[PDB]
Amino acid sequence: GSKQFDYIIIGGGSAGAVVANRLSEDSGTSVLLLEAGGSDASPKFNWMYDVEPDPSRDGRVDIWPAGKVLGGGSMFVRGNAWDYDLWAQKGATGWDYAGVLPYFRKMESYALNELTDLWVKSAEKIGIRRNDDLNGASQEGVGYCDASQKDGWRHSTAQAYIRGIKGKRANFTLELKAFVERIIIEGGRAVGVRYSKNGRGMEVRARKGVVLSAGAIASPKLLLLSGIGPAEELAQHEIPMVVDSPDVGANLQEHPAVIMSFHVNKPLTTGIGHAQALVKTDDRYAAPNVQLIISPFKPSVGLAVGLARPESRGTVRLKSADPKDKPLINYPLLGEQSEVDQMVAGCRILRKIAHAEPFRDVLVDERLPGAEVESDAELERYIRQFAFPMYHVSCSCRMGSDPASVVDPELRVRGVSGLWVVDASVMPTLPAGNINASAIMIGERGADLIKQQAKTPE
Ligand SMILES: Cc1cc2nc3c(=O)[nH]c(=O)nc-3n(C[C@H](O)[C@H](O)[C@H](O)COP(=O)(O)OP(=O)(O)OC[C@H]3O[C@@H](n4cnc5c(N)ncnc54)[C@H](O)[C@@H]3O)c2cc1C
């Protein structure tokens, strides 16, 4: 621990790069950023986290990619106010829509066709209202993704936050290929970090504290390895318990989606195309529950049915006490029958749209699901077999006001001083969209919160 910094930030992804940039704005604040990856898929720049067999999909085992690269890789932020107001309703005081909107604006400050038209026209004919200003800060209805909306902003990538400081700020230091193994906690306070680099074990110290920005998979894992988590989990791996925190690694959420495809005469994995439709499958829903997307590039058109807000929940646990082991991840992509019902209902809407004029006037044949797949049970079969995750993993280190939450609304880990979690893991619920922008926004507001806490004693 010969080296001492004011703050140590674990993880240089979307949120962590923002925190590093913003906290080092103060000349007298030294900042160290530790990133397991390098600068500038494959194991070199992808974690390739294995997921346990999924009973909702006959034990199917998926591989979740996650950025292992400074900043990231693989824009516009149409804030859905229902999602952030839901956060505040679940205890994230100050993180309501009115609370995050200034930080989406700060992000904007920092940043300094015929087939799609045909699809949107067909949606309107079937009765899907066109999205416009009267909707407010919802994207309910059908609209074009590549457009500027009154409820949307512009933002930058995390690589823009790092480019402005790397080798330019004396109070900022960066260690790549640094695999953080444990947070060091002494006297109820996070005082440093142990990591390995180049085959050697290192330790470094923090004067003011540690910021855990490792993302929704690695952050809960790091908390567990540091003794912060459910007592049952910690004892099993004989990790001394520092904080009994019941929800570390709980509340894991991901977006499921499935592709429909049609040939015509005249990717979608992450869920952005030329046009989208946030629609309600029933009127019993308070917010649009299904997202329909079209990204039209023998020749075919690609459509997607995504579930805006998952009902299933997963877990992140340890495989062992060995820090280099990957986490144990459980997530039933379709664990609730209603999730399938909504996605089947989504598939039927996409059919109505394609069969309605004028898009029907360019239709040829349904290609991927199959025209013969018509019964609810036949569509459920197709969904269970071809559904996929959109890589929007979040919510594993829930912020809230209840004493069971992992962090309070100021992002402090309950039970420990000088320790924050600032990344997508703190989300109480997965928003319907703009995940990466939401994570950047969390870094923006989290940096302000940490700066505020530094003005006053803990
Ligand atoms: C392949 C892919 C494509 C995506 N596409 C989209 C898209 O089109 N649109 C969208 O809105 N969202 C997309 N997302 C989601 C978005 O990238 C994430 O929601 C967002 O990056 C989360 O930010 P984060 O800071 O929480 O975590 P991350 O961005 O994952 O940052 C965490 C960082 O911590 C590092 N780290 C982890 N463990 C350690 C450790 N032990 N020691 C040191 N460093 C460590 C990781 O290497 C990483 O750099 C995509 C995600 C993936 C994986």
Written as one string, the DSSP assignment of 109-174 is HHT--HHHHHHHHHHHHHT-PBP-GGG-S--BEEEESSS--TTEEE---HHHHHHTTTTT-TTEEE
Protein residue with its CA nearest to atom 6 in ligand 1: 270
In this structure, which amino acid lies at residue 236? Q
* Among candidate residues 304, 357, 15, 355, the one with its CA nearest the CA of residue 145: 304
Asked if 449 and 103 touch (Cβ cutoff 8 Å), the reply is no
Element (H, E) at 89: helix 81-89
d(CA 5, CA 31): 6
CA of 263 to the centre of ligand 1 (A): 35
d(CA 250, CA 268): 28
Return the SS3 of 182: strand
Alpha helices in 268-412 (DSSP H): 337-355, 376-386
The β-bridge partners of 292 are 277, 305
Q: Answer yes or no: is the C-beta of 442 below 6 A from any ligand 1 atom.
A: no
d(CA 165, CA 24): 8
Asked if 117 and 455 touch (Cβ cutoff 8 Å), the reply is no
Let me know if 392 is a catalytic residue: yes
Q: Answer yes or no: is the C-beta of 74 below 6 A from any ligand 1 atom.
A: yes
Q: Answer yes or no: is the C-beta of 218 below 6 A from any ligand 1 atom.
A: yes
Return the SS3 of 342: helix
d(CA 105, CA 176): 30
Asked if 216 and 423 touch (Cβ cutoff 8 Å), the reply is yes
Tokens of residue 193, six digits: 């970090």
Q: Answer yes or no: is the C-beta of 67 below 6 A from any ligand 1 atom.
A: yes
| Three-class HEC string of 207-267 | EEEEEECCHHHHHHHHHHHCCEECHHHHHHCCCCCCEECCCCCCCEECCEEEEEEEEECCC
Asked if 97 and 85 touch (Cβ cutoff 8 Å), the reply is yes
Distance of CA 108 to the CA centre of its chain: 20
Residue 429: CB partners within 8 Å, gap ≥ 6?
Answer: 83, 86, 87, 90, 253, 309, 395
d(CA 135, CA 131): 7
Q: What is the DSSP string of 381-438?
A: HHHHHH-EE-S--B-TT-B-SSTTSSB-TT-BBTT-BSEEE-SGGG-SS--SS-HHHH
Own/partner pairs, 131-136, CB within 8 angstroms, 24+ separation = 131/278, 136/81
Q: Answer yes or no: is the C-beta of 390 below 6 A from any ligand 1 atom.
A: no
CA of 114 to the centre of ligand 1 (A): 34
d(CA 158, CA 153): 16
d(CA 235, CA 100): 38
Centre a 10 Å sphere on the Cβ of residue 381 and count the other Cβ atoms it contains: 14
Residue 89: CB partners within 8 Å, gap ≥ 6?
Answer: none
Beta strands at 4-10 and 31-34: parallel, antiparallel or unpaired: parallel
Centre a 10 Å sphere on the Cβ of residue 220 and count the other Cβ atoms it contains: 32
d(CA 250, CA 270): 23
Asked if 255 and 395 touch (Cβ cutoff 8 Å), the reply is no
Residue 363: CB partners within 8 Å, gap ≥ 6?
Answer: 262, 263, 264, 354, 355
Q: What is the resolution of this structure in A?
A: 2.1
Domain boundaries defined on the chain:
1-37+158-254+313-330+393-458, 38-76+146-157, 77-112, 113-145+255-312+331-392
How many residues does this entry show for the chain? 458
In this structure, what are the phi and psi dihedrals at residue 119, rounded to the nearest 5 degrees?
-60, -45
Burial of 371 (0-12, 13-18, 19+ CB in 10 A): exposed
Phi-psi region of 143 (alpha: psi -120 to 50; beta: other; left: phi over 0): beta
Residue 66: CB partners within 8 Å, gap ≥ 6?
Answer: 46, 47, 49, 215, 217, 218, 391, 393
- Kindly state the DSSP code that residue 298 receives in the 8-state scheme: -
Return the SS3 of 15: helix
* Among candidate residues 67, 79, 11, 7, the one with its CA nearest the CA of residue 449: 7
Question: Could you tell me where the beta strands, DSSP code E, fall in 17-103?
Answer: 31-34, 49-50, 63-64, 76-78
Method: X-ray
CA of 457 to the centre of ligand 1 (A): 32
Q: What is the largest CA-CA distance in the chain?
A: 71
CA-based torsion, 113, 119, 123, 125: positive or negative: positive
In this structure, what are the phi and psi dihedrals at residue 328, rounded to the nearest 5 degrees?
-85, 115
* Among candidate residues 277, 37, 326, 14, the one with its CA nearest the CA of residue 135: 277
47, 68, 74: which to mutate for ligand 1, most atoms within 8 A of CB? 74
CA of 74 to the centre of ligand 1 (A): 10
For the chain, first and last CA: distance in Å?
A: 23
Catalytic residue among 155, 255, 274, 392: 392
Protein residue with its CA nearest to atom 35 in ligand 1: 11
Q: Answer yes or no: is the C-beta of 36 below 6 A from any ligand 1 atom.
A: yes
Q: Answer yes or no: is the C-beta of 337 below 6 A from any ligand 1 atom.
A: no
In this structure, which amino acid lies at residue 78? R
Asked if 118 and 362 touch (Cβ cutoff 8 Å), the reply is yes
| Half-sphere CA count of 136, side-chain side, radius 13 A | 8
Asked if 443 and 410 touch (Cβ cutoff 8 Å), the reply is no
CA of 378 to the centre of ligand 1 (A): 35
The β-bridge partners of 10 are 34, 212
